[model samples]
Target: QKTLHIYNWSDYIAPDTVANFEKETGIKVVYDVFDSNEVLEGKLMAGSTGFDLVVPSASFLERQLTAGVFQPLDKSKLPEWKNLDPELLKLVAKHDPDNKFAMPYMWATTGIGYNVDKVKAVLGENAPVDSWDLILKPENLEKLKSCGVSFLDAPEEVFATVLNYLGKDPNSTKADDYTGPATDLLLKLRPNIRYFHSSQYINDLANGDICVAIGWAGDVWQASNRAKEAKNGVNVSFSIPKEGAMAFFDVFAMPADAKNKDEAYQFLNYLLRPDVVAHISDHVFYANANKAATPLVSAEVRENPGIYPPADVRAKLFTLKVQDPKIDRVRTRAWTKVKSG
Candidate 1:
């Protein structure tokens, strides 16, 4: 029996992606998920994760590439690679260099997800729905606290956003940058946040249990669709803050010790097909890096500005860079304080 072990972000792919791959190729698949990059990076750094394929965002992938944790991709097996967007390929090259080790999958933004009616009721008609002020301002969060709020448990995303909001470089490596203004800002907003989590907010937002969340673009869209499907009267919406937000590219990479390299390549090629990836984009509501898949995606998703931001909005999106060990510790400590307090 042939088998492939894969690890990826929770709720990241279409519901049938794995099943379809299994049925078409007759290769058994064992899939698992994690919500935070920190957790995934830790496993990769420790070695022997035993995963044939793992998805890591660009910044994390860059760091791991330096550690020699991945095997260079064999492009001959991935003929469908030509279908990927060249612009995205260039962007990812900053991390993978010439696009050697990873295959770009889905790219997304970290932004606000809010329950429309609930937010309007709390903030009234003139809410700063399009800006970081909607959530970063203490007064707004204080009022929204009664309803409910959540934030991603991702330190890098949260820290970079807060830093950018404070007019500093989102990828600052200075220790004081995190321990000072950034931590101070997070600590002030900490009291209003209902909880710090990644995937849990999806269901919570869909069910109207939480009115606001600092989350990934696609996860919020999933919540919006879930509400519509359930006829739950929960009006969910996602926004790419006017002040800018973190943008990320999650890629498929094989671990250095992976036992099923050939099978992993088969799965990667399967995922890269235009029709197959288009179905994933329509279902997950995130923009794919596949150029040929765009027209095949549902019109609703294709036309949604929040899903695929316009040129001006895209210009405001900043991608995180790999941080040094000292900087990483500073960020981890500051994040711990915000969560613990």
Candidate 2:
């Protein structure tokens, strides 16, 4: 039997997606999970990752694309490509030019996820829940520290958001922006953050172990659903802050040395089917790039402003670019300092 290997983010797919694909295609699926772009990029950069398809966010994909870690996608195999949202394709093209090497899978924003009741208790009913002030303001974080606070271990997303909050360019390539204002702001709030991690906050938020997190949209929604399922009285809510947020698109790209191109294309085509795309979106709580899949998604998930921002909120969203190597080194150092302090 033939097998297809996939490397994707943890909890990014419907539980049945792979099984259904296997049952239909008779292709054994070896699906793997990763939590951060850095981890996935590390594997790709090392070459011959043994992955048929890997999901990487656009910013990381930009550098990987340049490194020639992936093969240009053959659109002829992806007949359903027409279903993808052109607007999103345009955004992703910034990273994969001409939409040549990658296919956008799911998209989300980096924003605040909080325990609604706990936040209200600490900051009162008038908390700046809809703005970055809730977490970016050191005073608010200091008060919320009693409950708990967490930030994603992602340097780019965290730094970009901080830069925006400080009235600087979210995609600034300036080394001083990272080492100066961004580092200073993070240091001021460092004591309040319980920990820095990319995925643990999902369970922590649902279990009432943490009160606030700067996290991805779908992960926060997953926490909210879990808390509801547990009936734990923890109300997790996500907000795309008014000060703006980073919108990221996770894309599926074939590794340059992928062994099973035929099997990989089969799975890719299967994923683009509107029904399948909608199922994944419904399960993961992230927006799919499939325009046709939108209506098939549940109204609760589709209509959630945090998951699918409205026009004005959408206008404020920014996507990060691959940084100059010099700026990357400086940003990484600044991130380390922020974390240790």
Candidate 3:
């Protein structure tokens, strides 16, 4: 009679899949949401009541999965689980080893999102291509500065962008990516930021309250759709900067001491099932790694460059490597100073 409790980000999963899982298995599911990955980690390890599934980016998952808060996945319970992409399957295997720890879910990269109307009104037809520096330039900043723009609040992300903008490694957290050239580049973009934001910016962008929002690949996806569904049908557009985009991913993991391992595996298998991934991508409006679910995605989603960038563009995107926590601490400290001053 064990049940599953999934802790995830806001609107990150498709609602229908959750409902369907409950209906088919009769397993009670409870979901909790958070806006930051660090916050999510703190809550789970703070000895809180039972949480079965934890969905986090692959980088963080590498840390948490080994830190012993998660349990490994068991595929014996998953009959349809044989259908995941081999690359994705290999990625999960590296973390899960014996296939007892984690599952691959939605994976995407960070890009730029603009209020298209705002851009056309100001930049006219000369907007930057899917590049990262459009918002970093002084002249462009002059035009859109009054629109209450936002850069992502995540230190790792901001720092990563600096590395890319400065032609350094987006995954590099060495001291070089923070100060010197990186710091100079960041200070340049500071004036353009009304504030640094996380996911709530999704709603802000939808209401036309913010002109430029940056952060996760999925955030752009979320904002693009929220705007589309707005009363007047927002003309928001998603793009990457002139600089390459940073690739990011979120994976599903279990607790090391999870009391209900068997049931959790069944739930993980259920989530990876093709139909469930399709339901998630459609409802969540983000990219999917569930290659098996490709056919089920809506025609609109299948064609959305925001969610599924073409191969060449995707080739330009790069994933943030596993962060060196030692350096990440330095990044957090420096980011605080940049945001404040």
Candidate 4:
């Protein structure tokens, strides 16, 4: 049997999960990682990504499926698909329409991550830790700039968050918003931002390299534990902004040119099993969409407010849509300006 090539986000799945799959299945997995959806989308659009499986966010999944880069999933091959939470699957169904091309893997909210010590040091006992103002306001971020800061380089979160911060729709389809208002807000924050990458802030926050970031909830939670384990003076924490934020699922999808569909299906089916995914949720600190896996999760993970937000905050959460391509082009062009400056 040939090795199954899998491309995914870095540090997304636990090592032992892959090890056990290899140990029991006899087929080796050649795993690769990508930092941004844009990078993966570039490869997918160019054709023959050479990966048996790849993960893409829900919005991109809808857009790419329309472009025909992915193969329709065979649910009969995925017996454990039944194990997923129905409500969450319904959310994906809004894009996938009967879960044809994607499987919800891990879901999280995009919000603020901070160094508890440094935030207290700068804001001095009354820091607005739970507010978007911590990073969005130039005055507040300027104080944190002495240490370091980052925003996720992805436009979906950044544009949407800026929109929401301004009391506008986070998932606006209007191109003018991305090009005009969103552009202005990002430019204002540009001076305070040290750099933007999807993955590096996890360790940076944990090690005291960057005091704050607009990042995913789970990654920041992992950073918090890493700091705790290191026993350093650094302490990382995360918050869902009081204004609102975006929640998204990164899904497992098979490419149309996938060389080993059987192995890919087997691997995905293996992962959906409750115990297997429960282990993943515990390790990654992101919420698992596997409903059956919840009881098996540790009390700490099942109960963490950051992972599962309280009801009022949950009401404020919004999911993004696959925007009109013309709008996407505007976002891309606008994002280029934000990055270059």
* TM-score (all chains, Cα) for each model: 0.99, 0.98, 0.91, 0.98
lDDT of each: 0.94, 0.93, 0.73, 0.89
Cα lDDT tens digits for candidate 4, 269-314: 9889999989998888988889999999888888998897777878
Q: Estimate, for each residue in 1-341, the C-alpha lDDT of model 3 and write its tens digit.
A: 65878778777887577778888888877878877777777765675447777787776776676567765555666677667766766655554555565667777667677888887777778777456656777678778887758887677766787688777887775775676677777787787788887876777777788887776666766677776666666677778764687766677777666666666777777877787888888877777777778898997887887688787887777666666767777777778878997
Decide which is better by TM-score, 1 or 4.
1
Stretches off by above 4 angstroms in model 1 are none
Best by lDDT: 1
RMSD of candidate 1 to the truth, in angstroms, is 0.8
**Sort by TM-score, top down from the best:** 1, 2, 4, 3
For model 1, the run of ten residues with the poorest summed lDDT: 321-330
Q: Which residue runs of candidate 4 sit more than 4 Å off their true CA positions?
A: none
lDDT of prediction 2:
0.93
Which 10 residues in a row give candidate 2 its minimum summed lDDT?
304-313
Candidates, ranked, lDDT: 1, 2, 4, 3
Residue pairs with backbone atoms closer than 3 Å in model 4 (clashes): none
